[model samples]
Target chain A: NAMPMNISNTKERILAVAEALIQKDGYNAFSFKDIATAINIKTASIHYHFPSKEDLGVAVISWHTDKIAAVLSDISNNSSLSAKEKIQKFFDAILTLTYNSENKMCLGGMFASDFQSLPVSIQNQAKKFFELIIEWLKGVLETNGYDNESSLSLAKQIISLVEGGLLLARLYGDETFLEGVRHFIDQTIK
Target chain B: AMPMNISNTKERILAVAEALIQKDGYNAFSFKDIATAINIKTASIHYHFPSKEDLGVAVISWHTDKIAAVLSDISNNSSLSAKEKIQKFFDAILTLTYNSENKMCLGGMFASDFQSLPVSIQNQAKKFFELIIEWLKGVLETNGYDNESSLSLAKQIISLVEGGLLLARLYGDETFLEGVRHFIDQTIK
Candidate 1:
C-alpha cells in the first residue's frame, strides 16, 4: 500500500463512526477495533489518523463543536428570523437529534455522561460548549426583553431542560416526550 | 468455608452494582467488575442475579423504590405545605449525590446508558419515572392546582432536576443542582 497525498474520507469516516459510537454507547463503551471493523479499515489506519484514543476523543469533540457552531450560526445569523424564532429553531434542531428512532443524545450530553472519565481537555471543551450555549441564549433572551439575571437563569434552565429532555425521551422510549423541551422553551420565552 | 446464615450477599451485589453502574454504565460495567469490587466470585453474583440484565433490573428497581418511598414520605407529610414538600424532595435528590462523590441520580444515570440496556431494564427505568411523576401529580392536584397540567409539570420537574445533576457532574460543581431547587421553589410557590 502507498500513502495518498491530501484527499480521503479516512479521517471523516473515523470521526463519524466515533461520534455515533460515543453517542449511542458512551465514551468508554467503544474501541478502536470497533471503529475499524465498522468501516472496513485496519486499526493501523485509524492510528494514522488518530494516534491514541485520547487524540480521537479530542478530535471528535472538537469536530462536534465546529459542527454545532455552524448550525447555531446559521440560525442566529439569519437576519430575517426574530429572536424567539431563532431560539425555537435552535432547539428544534436539537429535538430532531433526540427524536431520531435510534435514541441518541447530543454529543455534549454524551460527554456529560462520560464526564468524570474523560480527559481534562475534553471536559473543558464540553464546558466551553455549554458556556457558549448559555451566552448565546442569554443574548437571545435579552434581545427578547428579558433582564440580565433572568436571561442567565433562564438560559441555564433551558440548557438543563434540553439535556434532561434528551435523557428522558430516550429512557422512556417516547419521542413525544421531548415535547417537554418545546414546552420548556415556550415557558422560558412566554 | 461454610454457608453463612446472614446471606447478605444479595444486598452487597446490588449496592456494588449501583456504584459501578453509576460511575460507569450498563455496558461499561459488568458482572466481572462487580466481582472484582466486592471480592466475590462470579458464581456468587450469578446466584443472586441470574444474568447481567437480571442484576441491572434489580439494581434500578431497588434504587427507584428507595427514591419513591422517600419522595412519597415527603409528599405524604401532613404538616408541611406542598411548597415545603417540593423543596425537600428537590433537596433530598441533590443531597443524594452531593453528599457522595458527585454521582448522578440512578434513573438519570441509567438513562444515559439507555440505548445499551435490555428491554426489561428499560421497562424498569420507565416505571421509575412513571411512579415519580404520578406521585408528584397527586401532590400538585391536591394543592389547589388544576389536575390537567400537573402531569406535564411533574415530567418537566424531574427532567430539569435529572438534567441539572448531569450538568453538575460534568461541570464538577454542586451549585447546578441548587439551581434546580431554585427553579422548583419558584414553580411550587
Candidate 2:
C-alpha cells in the first residue's frame, strides 16, 4: 500500500493544521481544500475524519478548549505560585501566543469576529472559553484580597484588557503591545 | 440612464464592503456577493475596483481615515483635559461598536482574518493601528507621562478597547469594556 496506515497521526495532523489555519486566518477563511493542501492529504480524506465542516469546527473548538482548560487548571492548582504570580503567568502565556510577527487570534477571539454567522453550538464553545478565563481571573482577584464584587468586576476588566490588548498588538504587528496587561497586574494586585 | 448612476453605485459598493468585512472576514465575501446584494452585474464591480483586494484595501483606508479625522479633532479641542480626550475616544469606539451591536471594529475583524487577506489589505490594517497608537502616545505624553511610558500606556488603552469590545459582545456584557475605562482612570490618578 502506498499510503501509511497510522490512522491517529493523520487525524492529529488534520486537527493541528486546521487549528493553525483557523487561528491564523479565521473559521471561514480556510477550507477543507486549504487544509488538504497544507497537510498533503486529499479533500475527501478530511471529510472522512469529520463528516462536515461544522463537524470539523466543533472538533477544533472542543479540542482547543480542552487544551486551554488544562493549562489554566495547572496554573490554578499549583501551590507554589502566589495568586498574583499565577495571574502573571497566565498573561505571560498570552504573550507567547504572539511568537511570530504574525500574531494569530485565539479560538475565542476568532469566534468573536464572526459571532453572528456561527452556529449556536460553535458559539457556546467560544463562550465556554471566555467564561473559564473570567472565572479563573475572579478567583485570583479574590485571592488577592479584593471583595467579591470587586473581584468579579476586575476579573472581567482584566480578561477584556488582555483580549483587547492582544487584538491591538496583533493588528499593530507588535507582541509587546500586551505589556499593557502586566501593568494592571502590578497596579491591582500589588 | 435612470438606473445607470455611477456615483450611487460606487458609494453603495463601498458601504456594502465595509458592512460585510465588519460582519464577516474579507475571505467570506466576494465580488459575486457584492453584485448580488447591490443588484449590479459582477462586471460592474470589477470595472470600479478592478480587484477584490483593491476594494478591500480602499474600504479599510477610508474607515481608518474617518477615525483619524475624528482623533485629530479630539486632539485639537483645547477645552478638554487629556484624560477627558482619552475617555471621549473610547466612548466613540463603544458608541459605534458596542452600543450599536456586537460588531467588532473593522480593523480588529480584518486582523483576525489577516492570513487570508491580500498583502495590500493586510498592510492597510496595520497602518490603521500604527496611526492610532502614535496619536495616543502623543496624547499620553501631553498628560505628563514620559515618552516610553506614554507609548506603552497608549498601547494598553487601544488593546483594552479593541479586546474589550470584542469580548463584551461575545460574553454578552458591556461592563467588560467599562472595566477598562476604570482601570485607566486609576492609573492616571
Candidate 3:
C-alpha cells in the first residue's frame, strides 16, 4: 500500500523514518515533530506509539539490531557459501546499504559519535548492537581457522574498517573508499 | 606568568572548539558554548573566528598542522622502528581519548556531521584525513611495503583507528582501542 494501512505497519514506518534521520543526522538533530512531519502523522499519534523520545530511540536501535541479526544469520546458515563467501556477503550487505543510501553511515557508527549525549537506554542498545556484530564476526573468523584471540581481534578490525570506510566515503563523496575497504577485506580473509 | 595574549586567546578558542567537536559533534556545539567553556564573551569569539563556519575551518586547520608536526616528529625519531612509530601513533590516540572521557577523533566526529557541515569545513576535514593517510602510506613504504600495498594498508590502519575510537567511546573503555595494537603487530611483524 502507498501508505501504512495498519497499526503495526505504521509503527514500522515510524521506526524506518527515525532510523534514516538518525543515520543522516545524529540523534540530537531530530525530534518527534520531525518524524511526525516526515511520516505524515500528527505528533499525538507518535506519542501514542512511542510515549517518549527515549522510547523511540530505543525502538530504533532495537529494530536495527534485529534487522541486522536476521541478515547475518541468513549469511551464516547458507551452507552453500564458504567462510570467505559469507564474509564477502557481510561486507556487501553493509557497503551496498550505505552506497544506496547516498553514503550515509551505519546506525551504529553514527550513534557512536552521538553516544555521550544519548539517553542511557539508547546507549545500552547501541552497545548491544556492536557486541552482536562482533560476536557473529568472531564466529565467522573462527570457522575460517582463526583461533579465539585472533578471531576476536580480527572481528573488531573488520567492523572498524567498515565504520571508518563508511565515514570516509561519506566525507569525500566517493564510494571507492568503501570499495578499497572491501578489497582489503577480500585480501585479509585469506 | 604571562598574560593571555591575542594569539593565546585564538589558540584557546581553537582548542576548546576542537574538544567540543570531538566530544559532541560539529553542529552540536556553538560559539556561545565555547564562550561559556573558555570564560569569554561571544563577541570575543567573533573577533577571532567571525563565524561558526570559520571556527570550524580553523579547528580542522589547527588539527591538520598539529598532526603534520607530529608525523614529522615521528619521522625524525631515528631510534624507533616503523612498527614502533605506528604503535606510538596508536598510543597517542588512545591516551587522548582516555584523558578526554573517550571522545572520538576530531576528523571522525566531523565526518559524522558531514551532511550538516559547510563546504569550507568539509574541505578542511577532508584534508585532515588525507594528511594522515598520506603520511601513513609513506611510513609503510619506508618499511619496504610496495606502494600499492602500502596505500591500502594505510587506509586500513586509519579505518581501524577511526573505527576503534568509535567503539572505544561507545563502551567508555579505552581497551576497545587496544585491539588496534594487535592488528598493528599482525600487520607489521
The CAPRI category of model 3 is medium
lDDT (tens digit, per residue) of candidate 2 on B18-113: 877776668778888888988999998888899888998889998898899889999999997888888888877776577764667888887777
Q: Which stretches of candidate 3 lie over 4 Å from their true place?
A: A1-8, B1-7, B172-175
Model 1 CA deviation exceeding 4 Å by range: A1-8, B1-7
Write the residue-wise lDDT of candidate 1 on B1-189 in tens digits: 988767388998998888777765666677888889879999988898898999989998998888888987897789988778877887787666645677778788777877767889888988888888888788888777787678777878888888888888775655567668777777775
Fraction of native contacts, model 2: 0.86
Chain A TM-score values for every predicted structure, listed in order: 0.91, 0.90, 0.93
**Largest DockQ belongs to which candidate?**
2
lDDT of 3 by residue, B85-177 (tens): 899877766666655766789988888888777889888888999998898898888899998888878887888789888887765654557
- For every candidate, what share of the true interface contacts is present? 0.52, 0.86, 0.66
Candidate 1, true inter-chain contacts retained: 0.52
TM-score for all models, in order of appearance: 0.88, 0.90, 0.89
lDDT of 2 by residue, A41-156 (tens): 99999999988888888888898878877888898889998988999988877665543424676767888787767888888888887888888889877887988988888888
For model 3, report DockQ. 0.64
- Which residue pairs collide in model 3, if any? none
Alpha carbon deviation, residue B187, candidate 3 (Å): 1.9
